[PDB]
């Protein structure tokens, strides 16, 4: 009897799992919302600088209307290589945002110290790929909480806590090509291996080098470390980048996983839309919503409040035609990156509606218990939309100057709804509904144009 | 000089051949119609129970409008495994219908006894895959006739004879997980290998076990058996599941093979339609036509009558917009599973037209020489439509409660055109065109709702 | 740590490079236009006879509206095999036209003699594939010039010179299965290896056989010859048919390469159109423009004139809705194969506009310095359009009796604009705008129907 080759099967469940970390794929936790869980780990936050500028350039006539296609190709070529390194070193990519990604090595506490070494090595080999746009890496380690929120058809997750705040702080101090360790990371790490320099007015440190002792063999050490990695591809599957590539059909699991992915992506996965339809440079309105709490590291407090805000946000977005693209913790608060005008989702008066939706969200969320401040930034223009990452691990994301602008507005103008000039001028709303604002110097924004507060219909 | 790898070529002829058995692919018989041929073999009829119930469940809100996609994934995952086993054991899959399939091992008479052993083993290994919805297996052996019928643009085939009737009888007696042998099968088989129990009021037997003698080696025995298998992948091609995967372009052959496949499938094969467009849960009307003959095992009699009925059926289906999905022998007669509303084929007043088409077919077929009785069942509702099977061997098929209902109506209400309540109520026809019928208890139907005879315009 | 398999990456740059020779892919020359360069090499011109007749036959009812799909399948099956041989023997396929292709082995002068041997062998192994429609092969060797012309969004190239004229002359003398050598080829070749017969009234010769001396080993000789082949896949990439399959994203390079490929092809490459949409048998109008010069072998003279004509042609084609499918040197002159009605490009009054565009091109090009004669043939009917070649090397092309007719009209009726009867009769133009022409016997045309000169609006 023959023993024919088994072909890779690219079932819809496997395709869906590309869009999600192991934390979710193999999580098997309750369908109740909010759901919280607690663990320890090391985080890596990898940022590619210069892609948002490249984004603007890919709109120019030189790209002959194939800007989006060229941008996603060059971005994915570079991001794919980073993803491969993270996965080979045993990390779980949690999320992509723009040209940045966040990865997790979940371990028990006793193994944090060794795993930090692995992650440092990984992070130095990532810098290598590009020594030959810059990459910056922040690392943190310690306690981590996960929150899963949503309704009967949609799910979102995020990670929370001091390590999560730390990893974003660390990445923001990095220069071109630094690997920065949070203070707790530096304190938990194997200091006999790792040569650092202090960072000015900072407790975080910079890695100069990995200097292992005489008898040290990284491959044997890494092997020891795989004992603690639940899903590291092994044995018959050691040629795979993810165990999730072996997932088999299972309707209950697929029903649970699909809730995390946008309907237009599921349409492509189901071979009901061309695989190229979602890469585009298109005019949209970004509504960037930030919620601040008394204590943002405390999942049992903030988890219900986020769920409550979520329930309202999704109902107003449904009505005024928008989508939540991403949710994550910023240095301050839980942020919802919302988009009006995604592929196949393009209402008329998109701008007016973005502004009224923002106001509704603002008024409702301001009265949710435990939410201290709501801030919303609204900006409109041409943004890149597309699936970013590796074949085995990728997500739909948005990149562009107006995305960055909406995020900076919500942080620099807290407690109000602000909009840019495009939104102001193109809205069908009377001028006294706005207030023209003082110009602020904003980290990473060349010249915003005039900014406005959306004051609303009365007062 | 280099010797670069030859890539699998997935020519349109190869894609077309996935939809057909070797019996047709390598048949090279005359284009005249009807065409009949005669041979001997073993048949296996494998039924997956519980898929039509699963079908109903995949319509519920929990599947979030991806019911069809989830159903076809889970069905194909399981059916694919069965197909692989059949193919590795040297069988030719003849046809899929719903969640059931029919396979053939064509051999010369002297080899029936050994080949039965191979098929029994195959059938026990199929039961294995699922011990870890149930599968039931009927086996038969003996004389088999093939009939090919059609016109200049379309071809259909079916198998006929006592073995074919036997294999369906055998499969209907099976409990969850039985392998049942027809009486002739049991009589031709190697009784020193095979432990059976009798079945009550039945000459068919149930296989308890394969108990081979001391010196027996299944792999050596199977090798001996491959001498008699014309198309068993071998040598350079022993890694392939089908020789048909090596078919090369040949316009004359492709013109002959395409006539068996529906135009919408050929559109997908030709990369002119998305590969996901044909998996759907959609409202259709099933018109299930049964023709009974004096002697249904006698191809030279029934073949012309089937061709004559076919010519008329296809002309009325063209006019009132319907398709023949499948044709096969039932316990009694030749059945045409006809469908109104397939993908891209959805007329208005679909129901009225289904009923007038049914009446036309009934009146014409009743006067075809040798057709003793015509019976037609008409039912409408949501049915699963899609390509079922393995990558290398699959077919378009329909599954659902209304498919089963139309088949049961035509068997339990012989000699008339019957319809369900959906059809009755939604037709644009006056009520006295119908007769409300006595309720019958029907094998495999929970509660049909009221049933009607379509009496027609006069009387 | 695992070392997972790297998957073939099928980036858009790689897909674009399939449509272009190495001469362009790895050319890295200036964006100024015209650009000329000069080198030496051997050319092979391979013609498949009988495909244009097959084309007509694939329109018949027997192909059941899948003529185009069947034609492209059978053509590509055969052409692919020829492409593989050319590539394995180290050639660069420059261009496909219809069922013919032109290949280049670029080498330094001292190596012409050995390389001719390699090309002869290649050409005899191509004849072999089909001894088991005919192939004819013309070979030439010597000085070659390349011209690149175009504007800011589009680029075209062609090769020019005595060797290029020679290779077309040689291929036109060939009978079924001859390999013919240009006179210069025969003079530069290793005459101790190659047995020839003279050809009547011709200095070109026919190859009867390769007869290598005792100590000769073709594989060792070929290896020596690879020293001179810049891009021969080797080492880690020796399993590849083209080095271009390893191209990595590079926006500057992709911007330069995409200018050679039609927008509808780039749409398919970008997964924004189904991969089957461009294979069709469709009614179009061919406008075949020939420009003759005093000296057609002299790139520095003719290159500016071609660029000047190009600039005007492309502006009139944009306005009256047409496309340049191909440009190449004929026995006499530079020819532009222009098409009205390509996929997605189908204006109404296509015929009138084809004729006015032809007149505009004629009047303008006649006054370009160095262009001695302009001749334009216009014919309309059903032509095959599609991507022809191998997966790794293919191009969009048109095949059909009306393509051949337009080419023959422009050569047999020099110095005027001519049209066929379909164009004449279907144009919305008055009859005195035409002159009915004497019938000429035209190489390769059965019966043209009446032919007309487009005289134009006055005189
Ligand atoms: Cl997160
Ligand atoms: Cl059958
Ligand atoms: Cl050329
Ligand atoms: Mg960034
Ligand atoms: Mg069944
Ligand atoms: Mg030709």
Swiss-Prot record, chains A, B, C:
Top-rank taxon: Eukaryota
Tissue-level expression: Detected in airway epithelial cells and testis (at protein level). Weakly expressed in multiple tissues. Expressed in brain, heart, kidney, liver, lung, pancreas, peripheral blood leukocytes, placenta, skeletal muscle, stomach, thymus, airway epithelial cells, duodenum, jejunum and ileum. Very low level of expression in bone.
Segments forming a coiled coil: none
Domain Guanylate cyclase: 42-171, 285-410
Post-translational modification: Cleavage may occur to generate the active 48 kDa form.
Subcellular location: Cell membrane; Cytoplasm, Cytoskeleton; Cytoplasm, Perinuclear region; Nucleus
Effect caused by changing residue 168 to A: Reduces bicarbonate-mediated increase of enzyme activity. Abolishes bicarbonate-mediated increase of enzyme activity
Disease: Hypercalciuria absorptive 2: A common type of hypercalciuria, a condition characterized by excessive urinary calcium excretion. Absorptive hypercalciuria is due to gastrointestinal hyperabsorption of calcium and is a frequent cause of calcium oxalate nephrolithiasis.
Its biological purpose: Catalyzes the formation of the signaling molecule cAMP. May function as sensor that mediates responses to changes in cellular bicarbonate and CO(2) levels. Has a critical role in mammalian spermatogenesis by producing the cAMP which regulates cAMP-responsive nuclear factors indispensable for sperm maturation in the epididymis. Induces capacitation, the maturational process that sperm undergo prior to fertilization. Involved in ciliary beat regulation.
Name by which UniProt lists this protein: Adenylate cyclase type 10
Gene: ADCY10
Parent-protein start and end of this portion: 1 to 467 of 1610
